Amino acid sequence: MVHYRTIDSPIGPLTLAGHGSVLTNLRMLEQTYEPSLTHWTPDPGAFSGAVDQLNAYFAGELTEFDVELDLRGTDFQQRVWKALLTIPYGETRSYGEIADQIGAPGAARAVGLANGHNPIAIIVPCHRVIGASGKLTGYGGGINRKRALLELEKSRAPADLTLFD
Protein backbone atom coordinates (compact mmCIF):
# COMPACT_ATOMS: atom_id res chain seq x y z
CA MET A 1 0.00 0.00 0.00
CA VAL A 2 1.23 3.43 1.08
CA HIS A 3 2.43 3.96 4.65
CA TYR A 4 3.08 7.11 6.69
CA ARG A 5 4.98 8.42 9.70
CA THR A 6 4.64 11.66 11.69
CA ILE A 7 7.52 13.55 13.28
CA ASP A 8 7.81 16.84 15.15
CA SER A 9 9.59 19.99 14.01
CA PRO A 10 9.84 23.74 14.76
CA ILE A 11 7.17 24.61 12.14
CA GLY A 12 4.86 21.79 13.21
CA PRO A 13 4.14 18.04 12.98
CA LEU A 14 5.53 17.03 9.57
CA THR A 15 3.96 13.94 8.02
CA LEU A 16 5.97 11.76 5.60
CA ALA A 17 4.32 9.24 3.33
CA GLY A 18 5.10 6.98 0.39
CA HIS A 19 5.69 3.34 -0.63
CA GLY A 20 8.69 1.61 0.98
CA SER A 21 11.58 4.05 1.18
CA VAL A 22 10.25 6.56 -1.38
CA LEU A 23 8.64 9.84 -0.39
CA THR A 24 5.49 10.75 -2.26
CA ASN A 25 4.26 13.10 0.47
CA LEU A 26 5.52 15.52 3.08
CA ARG A 27 3.11 18.11 4.53
CA MET A 28 2.39 19.67 7.91
CA LEU A 29 -1.10 18.18 8.02
CA GLU A 30 -2.17 19.37 11.46
CA GLN A 31 -5.62 21.01 11.33
CA THR A 32 -6.46 20.57 7.61
CA TYR A 33 -8.42 18.03 5.53
CA GLU A 34 -6.36 15.17 4.07
CA PRO A 35 -8.71 12.75 2.27
CA SER A 36 -6.20 10.06 1.35
CA LEU A 37 -5.01 9.78 4.96
CA THR A 38 -7.60 7.02 5.66
CA HIS A 39 -6.08 4.86 2.94
CA TRP A 40 -2.68 4.80 4.73
CA THR A 41 -0.87 2.34 7.07
CA PRO A 42 0.97 3.75 10.11
CA ASP A 43 4.61 2.62 10.46
CA PRO A 44 6.69 4.40 13.15
CA GLY A 45 10.07 3.40 11.63
CA ALA A 46 9.87 4.17 7.94
CA PHE A 47 11.94 6.54 5.81
CA SER A 48 14.58 6.41 8.49
CA GLY A 49 17.13 8.19 6.31
CA ALA A 50 14.79 11.10 5.69
CA VAL A 51 13.96 12.01 9.28
CA ASP A 52 17.66 12.25 10.07
CA GLN A 53 18.14 14.57 7.13
CA LEU A 54 15.16 16.66 8.30
CA ASN A 55 16.27 16.87 11.93
CA ALA A 56 19.73 17.72 10.65
CA TYR A 57 18.23 20.27 8.29
CA PHE A 58 16.37 21.95 11.13
CA ALA A 59 19.53 21.99 13.16
CA GLY A 60 21.46 23.76 10.40
CA GLU A 61 23.90 20.90 9.76
CA LEU A 62 22.13 19.93 6.50
CA THR A 63 22.19 22.03 3.31
CA GLU A 64 21.18 19.49 0.62
CA PHE A 65 18.84 16.49 0.68
CA ASP A 66 19.56 12.97 -0.50
CA VAL A 67 16.11 11.37 -0.67
CA GLU A 68 14.25 9.49 -3.39
CA LEU A 69 10.95 11.04 -4.47
CA ASP A 70 7.99 10.24 -6.66
CA LEU A 71 6.17 13.41 -7.57
CA ARG A 72 2.80 12.71 -9.10
CA GLY A 73 0.96 15.51 -10.84
CA THR A 74 -0.02 16.96 -14.22
CA ASP A 75 2.80 17.39 -16.74
CA PHE A 76 2.92 21.12 -16.02
CA GLN A 77 3.22 20.50 -12.30
CA GLN A 78 6.02 18.00 -13.04
CA ARG A 79 8.03 20.66 -14.81
CA VAL A 80 7.48 23.26 -12.12
CA TRP A 81 8.53 20.87 -9.38
CA LYS A 82 11.58 20.01 -11.51
CA ALA A 83 12.64 23.66 -11.61
CA LEU A 84 11.91 24.08 -7.87
CA LEU A 85 14.46 21.41 -7.00
CA THR A 86 17.15 23.59 -8.65
CA ILE A 87 16.94 26.47 -6.18
CA PRO A 88 19.73 26.14 -3.63
CA TYR A 89 19.58 26.61 0.16
CA GLY A 90 19.69 30.28 1.10
CA GLU A 91 18.34 31.44 -2.28
CA THR A 92 15.01 32.45 -3.85
CA ARG A 93 13.42 32.94 -7.27
CA SER A 94 10.47 34.93 -8.53
CA TYR A 95 7.48 33.19 -10.04
CA GLY A 96 8.36 34.82 -13.37
CA GLU A 97 11.93 33.43 -13.31
CA ILE A 98 10.55 29.96 -12.85
CA ALA A 99 8.11 30.51 -15.69
CA ASP A 100 11.05 31.34 -17.96
CA GLN A 101 13.14 28.40 -16.70
CA ILE A 102 10.46 25.92 -17.72
CA GLY A 103 9.95 27.48 -21.14
CA ALA A 104 6.66 29.24 -20.86
CA PRO A 105 7.41 32.94 -20.52
CA GLY A 106 4.51 34.74 -18.84
CA ALA A 107 3.21 31.95 -16.67
CA ALA A 108 4.02 33.49 -13.29
CA ARG A 109 0.47 32.96 -12.05
CA ALA A 110 0.38 29.33 -13.14
CA VAL A 111 3.53 28.45 -11.18
CA GLY A 112 2.02 29.96 -8.05
CA LEU A 113 -1.03 27.71 -8.42
CA ALA A 114 1.24 24.79 -9.24
CA ASN A 115 3.28 25.60 -6.13
CA GLY A 116 0.19 25.25 -4.01
CA HIS A 117 -0.15 21.59 -4.98
CA ASN A 118 3.41 20.57 -4.10
CA PRO A 119 3.17 17.05 -2.62
CA ILE A 120 6.50 17.25 -0.73
CA ALA A 121 7.22 20.35 1.42
CA ILE A 122 10.71 21.50 2.40
CA ILE A 123 12.59 18.99 0.19
CA VAL A 124 10.89 20.27 -2.96
CA PRO A 125 11.39 23.85 -1.84
CA CYS A 126 8.12 25.65 -2.65
CA HIS A 127 9.08 28.19 -0.01
CA ARG A 128 12.07 29.53 -1.88
CA VAL A 129 9.88 31.34 -4.47
CA ILE A 130 8.40 34.83 -4.03
CA GLY A 131 6.42 37.34 -6.05
CA ALA A 132 7.78 40.78 -6.85
CA SER A 133 5.77 42.35 -3.99
CA GLY A 134 7.53 40.30 -1.29
CA LYS A 135 4.18 39.29 0.15
CA LEU A 136 4.22 35.60 0.99
CA THR A 137 1.33 33.13 0.45
CA GLY A 138 -0.49 30.23 2.15
CA TYR A 139 -3.53 29.43 4.26
CA GLY A 140 -3.48 27.25 7.38
CA GLY A 141 -0.66 29.34 8.85
CA GLY A 142 1.43 28.30 5.88
CA ILE A 143 2.72 31.82 5.55
CA ASN A 144 4.48 31.56 8.90
CA ARG A 145 5.91 28.18 8.03
CA LYS A 146 7.35 29.66 4.81
CA ARG A 147 8.67 32.70 6.67
CA ALA A 148 10.22 30.61 9.43
CA LEU A 149 11.87 28.36 6.82
CA LEU A 150 13.25 31.37 4.95
CA GLU A 151 14.65 32.88 8.17
CA LEU A 152 16.30 29.63 9.19
CA GLU A 153 18.02 29.34 5.80
CA LYS A 154 19.32 32.92 5.87
CA SER A 155 20.64 32.73 9.45
CA ARG A 156 23.13 30.04 8.42
CA ALA A 157 26.47 30.76 10.03
CA PRO A 158 29.37 30.56 7.60
CA ALA A 159 30.42 26.92 7.65
CA ASP A 160 34.16 26.89 8.38
CA LEU A 161 35.33 29.44 10.88
CA THR A 162 38.90 28.53 9.77
CA LEU A 163 38.60 30.79 6.73
CA PHE A 164 38.79 33.68 9.17
CA ASP A 165 41.96 32.35 10.85
Q: Domain locations in the chain?
A: 1-70, 71-156
Is there a contact between 118 and 84 (Cβ–Cβ < 8 Å)? yes
Radius of gyration of the chain (CA): 16
Please give the method by which this entry was determined. X-ray
Distance CA 153, CA 147 (A): 10
Q: DSSP class of residue 4? A: E
Phi, psi of 5 (to 5 degrees): -140, 145
At 53, which amino acid appears?
Q
Which residues have a Cβ under 8 Å from the Cβ of 142 and sit 6 or more positions away? Answer: 28
Considering only CA atoms, which of 60, 61, 104 is closest in space to residue 82?
A: 104
Q: Which residues are catalytic?
A: 126
Q: What is 71-156's CATH number?
A: 1.10.10.10
Dihedral sign from CA coordinates of 81, 82, 88, 92? negative
- Fold topology of 1-70: Double Stranded RNA Binding Domain (3.30.160)
Strand residues in the chain grouped as ranges (E) = 3-7, 14-18, 25-28, 41-42
Is there a contact between 130 and 92 (Cβ–Cβ < 8 Å)? yes
Q: DSSP class of residue 106? A: T
